[PDB]
Design a protein around this nucleic acid. Structure first.
Ligand code: ADP
Ligand code: ZN
Length: 700
RNA sequence: GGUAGUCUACC
RNA sequence: GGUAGCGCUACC
RNA sequence: GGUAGCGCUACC
């Protein structure tokens, strides 16, 4: 039974004409009800007319998959079979969706489905191409994520291949594309004309010409989704007395550690003067983010530079590692107070004490009691945060508080602080911390229930609770010195359906928030221009649509000419263990398989220790992995990668962070962060074949 | 960082 | 293990 | 616009 509202029916009109469209409506307006109605009309008209029908509904986050699948399925007759597909599944996708009418999927499942046929171990293993046009209608939930190299963008890439190459099979037609979103975003453009072009580009890439926007029933929409006021509350940042002394004394300690590096670089006769190429003087402002840019990029040079004396690499990597912890220590002092920041620093420094060098143990003893600095007052943001909690708890004993922070560790700290707060202890208010699941989901679900029952009344969370999760309506939303984009600004305040308040001690963070409100009104102005000058907008879409196919071909041509040139250079790279530098193999021995990079040198098995995973753990993991491999050399044991099952055979893949490249015939030490950087700059492994699988199955 | 445009000072 | 996006920042 | 670093989240 469908009791469709009036503004919802308005949002179905374009789609019900069979046209591609994007549905823009606030979060909580019932877009999945709109989709369910469109799927119903699509299924019934086409079934009665004898035409084929098959729906696909995609959403980026797999946690609201059963929720949105059950919702849509409930509005449809039982003759229509619905099926969820996701990474936790073990059966191939091709079979699961064979006789299903509604597929509910994460978009990568469809990317792999459509690209699965392009690679094979041999000609007999080849698969028939699964054409995206097998679906007659496709829904992009949160379609503002159709940008750059995203899964959604790669699904539209398949669409445009079919649209321009004319390879669709007999009877097929281009599917109807429907997008759902609360806001398409401004692309951080500065005026309406540019934002209109940006939106035209997004439409073009989805092959959309007509936006679906509530125009008549605007008042009915206001009632069903109110306007929440977003207040900003700037707080004082203390730099007086103990707090400034802790900062000043930790700054002097870092300058001494920076001297350990310089004394070492002098012995190598290396002259100091970007920080990933040249050795540079550290920035004077130690707590500025530009300092971490220096420490981290410099540490890449230390493992990518060939020294000449003994221990130079050891003392520098020891120094840079301490400076990282000092920078984070300064960062934790901004959000809290020197007690917490020193607690972190003491633990980190005590952990490394057994291994510290001579010079480093001397420096720490000279500052460990000095940095103490007795004790300082509570951070103004904490006290102001507590004040907001008490003000709501007096008005309502059923008070639900959720606090967004930036880092996982900051949630750990703020949680421990709020629980040890005397005024909250008496007032009967416990707090729990929550973070992202990707690196137990049941231990997290347990916290959401306790938060709903009222056992815990405060929830310190990272940005995980901004989308997807079913978090109960909260009385107060606090953004503890944290802000990001304008799309989350519309969906971070959208969780209040209640007051959201930004507590910050940074003007740059207040400005970032006010800019995101300007972007919100800039969207309104632009959407109005689009609605009221529809012909000009159509011309913008046509201009952008004219660019897509030649751009796709240019991109494909660039990839092929890049491989062509790499083959003409014909450079061989030695692949060594990053820790022990034992030669693991060469680039000629690497093969690729589902964007995994496998060693196909049979001698490689004798350089590693396999470590299998139990079938219990494998079922929980949402990708292909059977175990790990570790460097076999003595006193190394570095994890070099993982085992993946290829046609029943375990094969070893290499982690990019566990290896270093050497041009064959030189000592040139190339460091790499990701395999995609290797494919882009050095060599492109060819697809793994059946011969390679057998050769490694036997050698093992 | 590159380009286009404008301004200001100077031969 | 691989990949995607977002924020901030550094250098050109 | 390009080249990098950190943090966050997600996906296979
Ligand atoms: N017309 C309606 N009839 C019944 N329930 C509705 C209606 N519109 C919205 N809802 C309910 O509102 C809730 C949120 O809707 P949802 O589709 O998740 O919104 P969106 O996906 O646009 O954020 C759902 O539980 C849904 O059942
Ligand atoms: Zn090793």
């Amino acid at each position: 039974g469908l009791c469709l509202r009036n503004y919802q029916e308005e949002l179905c009109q374009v789609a019900l004409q069979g046209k591609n469209t994007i549905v823009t409506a606030p979060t909580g307006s019932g877009k999945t009800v709109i989709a369910a109605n469109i799927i119903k009309e699509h299924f019934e008209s086409r079934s009665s007319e004898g035409k084929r029908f098959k729906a696909l509904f995609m959403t980026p986050n797999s946690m609201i998959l059963n929720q949105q699948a059950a919702s849509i399925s409930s509005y449809l007759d039982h003759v229509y079979h619905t099926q969820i597909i996701q990474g936790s599944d073990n059966v191939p996708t091709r079979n699961v969706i064979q006789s299903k009418d509604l597929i509910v999927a994460t978009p990568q499942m469809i990317v792999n489905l459509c690209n699965e046929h392009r690679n094979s171990l041999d000609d007999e293993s080849r698969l028939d191409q699964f054409f995206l046009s097998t679906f007659t209608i496709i829904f992009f939930d949160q379609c503002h994520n159709t940008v750059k190299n995203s899964p959604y963008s790669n699904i539209m890439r398949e669409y445009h291949y079919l649209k321009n190459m004319g390879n669709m099979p007999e009877g097929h037609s281009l599917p109807q594309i429907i997008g759902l979103t609360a806001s398409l975003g401004t692309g951080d453009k500065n005026d309406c004309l540019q934002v209109r072009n940006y939106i035209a580009g997004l439409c073009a890439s989805m092959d959309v010409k007509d936006l679906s926007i509530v125009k008549d029933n605007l008042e009915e929409l206001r009632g069903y989704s109110p306007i929440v006021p977003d207040k900003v509350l700037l707080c004082e940042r203390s730099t007086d007395g103990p707090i400034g002394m802790f900062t000043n004394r930790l700054t002097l300690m870092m300058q001494e550690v920076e001297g350990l590096i310089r004394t070492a670089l002098r012995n190598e006769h290396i002259g100091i003067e970007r920080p990933d190429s040249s050795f540079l003087d550290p920035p004077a402002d130690k707590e500025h983010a530009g300092y971490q840019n220096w420490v981290c990029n410099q540490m890449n040079l230390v493992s990518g530079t060939s020294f000449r004396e003994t221990g130079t690499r050891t003392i520098i990597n020891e120094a840079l590692d301490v400076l990282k912890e000092c920078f984070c220590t300064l960062s934790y002092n901004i959000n809290f107070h020197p007690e917490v920041a020193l607690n972190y620093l003491k633990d980190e420094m005590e952990y490394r004490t057994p291994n510290f060098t001579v010079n480093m143990i001397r420096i720490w003893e000279r500052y460990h009691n000095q940095l103490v600095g007795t004790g300082s007052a509570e951070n103004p943001m904490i006290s102001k945060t507590v004040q907001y909690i008490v003000e709501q708890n007096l008005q309502r004993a059923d008070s639900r508080t959720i606090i967004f922070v930036r880092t996982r560790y900051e949630a750990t700290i703020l949680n421990k602080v709020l629980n040890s707060n005397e005024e909250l202890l008496m007032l009967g208010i416990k707090s729990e911390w929550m973070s992202g699941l990707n690196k137990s989901k049941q231990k997290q679900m347990e916290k959401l229930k306790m938060f709903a029952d009222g056992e815990i009344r405060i929830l310190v969370s990272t940005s995980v609770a901004e989308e997807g999760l079913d978090v109960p309506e909260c009385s107060l939303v606090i953004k503890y010195n944290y802000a990001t984009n304008e799309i989350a600004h519309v969906q971070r305040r959208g969780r209040g359906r209640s007051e959201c308040v930004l507590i910050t001690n940074s003007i740059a963070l207040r400005d970032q928030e006010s800019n995101n409100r300007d972007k919100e009104s800039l969207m309104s102005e632009t959407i109005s221009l689009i609605q009221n000058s529809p012909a000009e907008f159509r011309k913008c879409v046509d201009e952008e649509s004219n660019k897509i196919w030649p751009r796709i071909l240019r991109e494909d041509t660039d990839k092929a000419q890049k491989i062509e040139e790499q083959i003409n250079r014909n450079i061989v790279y030695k692949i060594i263990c990053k820790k022990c530098e034992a030669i693991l193999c060469t680039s000629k021995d690497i093969r690729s398989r589902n964007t995994q990079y496998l060693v196909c040198d049979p001698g490689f098995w004798s350089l590693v220790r396999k470590t299998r995973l139990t079938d219990e753990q494998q079922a929980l993991i949402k990708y292909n992995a059977t175990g790990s491999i570790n460097c076999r050399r003595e006193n190394c044991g570095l994890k070099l990668g993982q085992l993946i099952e290829v046609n029943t055979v375990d094969l070893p893949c290499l982690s990019a962070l566990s290896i270093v490249l050497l041009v064959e015939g030189t000592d040139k030490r190339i460091i790499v962060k990701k395999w995609k950087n290797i494919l882009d700059k050095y060599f492109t492994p060819t697809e793994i074949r059946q011969l390679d699988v057998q050769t490694m199955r036997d050698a093992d």
